[PDB]
Design an enzyme around this catalytic site. Structure first.
Site, PDB file in Angstrom:
ATOM      1  CG  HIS A  64      -1.656  -1.296   1.439  1.00 51.75           C
ATOM      2  ND1 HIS A  64      -2.678  -1.735   0.625  1.00 51.75           N
ATOM      3  CD2 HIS A  64      -1.504  -2.245   2.394  1.00 51.75           C
ATOM      4  CE1 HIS A  64      -3.122  -2.900   1.066  1.00 51.75           C
ATOM      5  NE2 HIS A  64      -2.427  -3.231   2.138  1.00 51.75           N
ATOM      6  CG  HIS A 113       2.722   5.743   6.379  1.00 53.54           C
ATOM      7  ND1 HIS A 113       2.486   5.550   7.722  1.00 53.54           N
ATOM      8  CD2 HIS A 113       1.604   6.315   5.876  1.00 53.54           C
ATOM      9  CE1 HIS A 113       1.266   5.969   8.013  1.00 53.54           C
ATOM     10  NE2 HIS A 113       0.716   6.447   6.912  1.00 53.54           N
ATOM     11  CG  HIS A 150      -1.035   8.518   2.597  1.00 54.43           C
ATOM     12  ND1 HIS A 150      -1.767   7.349   2.621  1.00 54.43           N
ATOM     13  CD2 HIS A 150      -0.648   8.749   3.872  1.00 54.43           C
ATOM     14  CE1 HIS A 150      -1.836   6.905   3.865  1.00 54.43           C
ATOM     15  NE2 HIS A 150      -1.160   7.734   4.641  1.00 54.43           N
ATOM     16  CB  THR A 194      -5.898   7.726   6.479  1.00 56.81           C
ATOM     17  OG1 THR A 194      -4.532   7.398   6.191  1.00 56.81           O
ATOM     18  CG2 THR A 194      -5.968   8.987   7.326  1.00 56.81           C
ATOM     19  CB  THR A 195      -4.513   2.442   5.992  1.00 55.13           C
ATOM     20  OG1 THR A 195      -3.865   2.450   7.265  1.00 55.13           O
ATOM     21  CG2 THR A 195      -3.744   3.355   5.041  1.00 55.13           C
TER      22      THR A 195
HETATM   23 ZN   LIG Z   1      -0.878   7.568   6.660  1.00 52.10          ZN
END
Ligand SMILES: [Zn+2]
Ligand SMILES: [Hg+2]
Length: 257
Positions: free
Chosen positions: A61, A91, A93, A195-196
């Protein structure tokens, strides 16, 4: 399983994860003229001097830079937070194009990418227990725009070739997350979620106003990553962002004004 495509994307997540339509979902649009300065906010404290990175992983992802959180080292405190929150991973996005990619938006403006530095409340002993609590997590969100290169990001950029596909990881020691921070720590804050999936409603969001600038060639290399595993049909890792969700009468506070 869940992803970002037409058939497994954010609009599908609610079926396996009912909380997708919950009362404190993230991300949200930050309406700057609705957010109120909060005098009762303490100064925000980001202490990343002794941070110990371990490795980098393509999880199909995004990629996670994981940290050794077995001791109190890289910690977030102050601001809207009570107590101490430990850095566990970061991480990003990002988009297929510079005009999109961020999860939070500012007066509906989308940035090219968004960095999430994920921390867990040390009163709960570890991450897994923290995510069962309404104040279990704090995420420091930093927007990315395309311009000058970010020198402190290049070590991440250079390792991405070794972790092209889902499941691949690489040794990633001695990375300093201080090289990813903008000058100002002015922020908006609201209660929200991961948000995942599983979209757990355990996050105090702290979203910095000042974006960092990264180079076009830096983001381009993000876009060369794969969602698929090695030896599978190539699906570029792009547009791995969830769009803005209903605020639902939550209040966004600003640290500045
Ligand atoms: Zn995130
Ligand atoms: Hg929670």
């Amino acid at each position: 399983h869940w992803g970002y495509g037409k058939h497994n994307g954010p609009e599908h997540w609610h079926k396996d994860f009912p909380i997708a339509k919950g009362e404190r979902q993230s991300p949200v649009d930050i309406d700057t003229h609705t957010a109120k300065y909060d005098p009762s906010l303490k100064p925000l404290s980001v202490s990343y001097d002794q941070a110990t990175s371990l490795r980098i992983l393509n999880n199909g992802h995004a990629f996670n830079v994981e940290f050794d959180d077995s001791q109190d080292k890289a910690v977030l405190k102050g601001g809207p937070l009570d107590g101490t929150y430990r850095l566990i991973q970061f991480h990003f996005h990002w988009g297929s194009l510079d005009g999109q990619g961020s999860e939070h938006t500012v007066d509906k403006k989308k940035y090219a990418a968004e960095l999430h530095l994920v921390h867990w409340n040390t009163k709960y002993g570890d991450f897994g227990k923290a995510v069962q609590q309404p104040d279990g997590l704090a995420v420091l969100g930093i927007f990315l725009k395309v311009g000058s290169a970010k020198p402190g990001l290049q070590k991440v950029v250079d390792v991405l070739d070794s972790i092209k596909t889902k499941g691949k990881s690489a040794d990633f020691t001695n990375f300093d997350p201080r090289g990813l921070l903008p000058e100002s720590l002015d922020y908006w804050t609201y209660p929200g979620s991961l948000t995942t999936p599983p979209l757990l409603e355990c996050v105090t969001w702290i979203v910095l106003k000042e974006p960092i600038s990264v180079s076009s060639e830096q983001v381009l290399k993000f876009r060369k990553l794969n969602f698929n595993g090695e030896g599978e049909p190539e699906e570029l890792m792009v547009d791995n962002w969830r769009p803005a969700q209903p605020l639902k009468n939550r209040q966004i506070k600003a640290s500045f004004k």
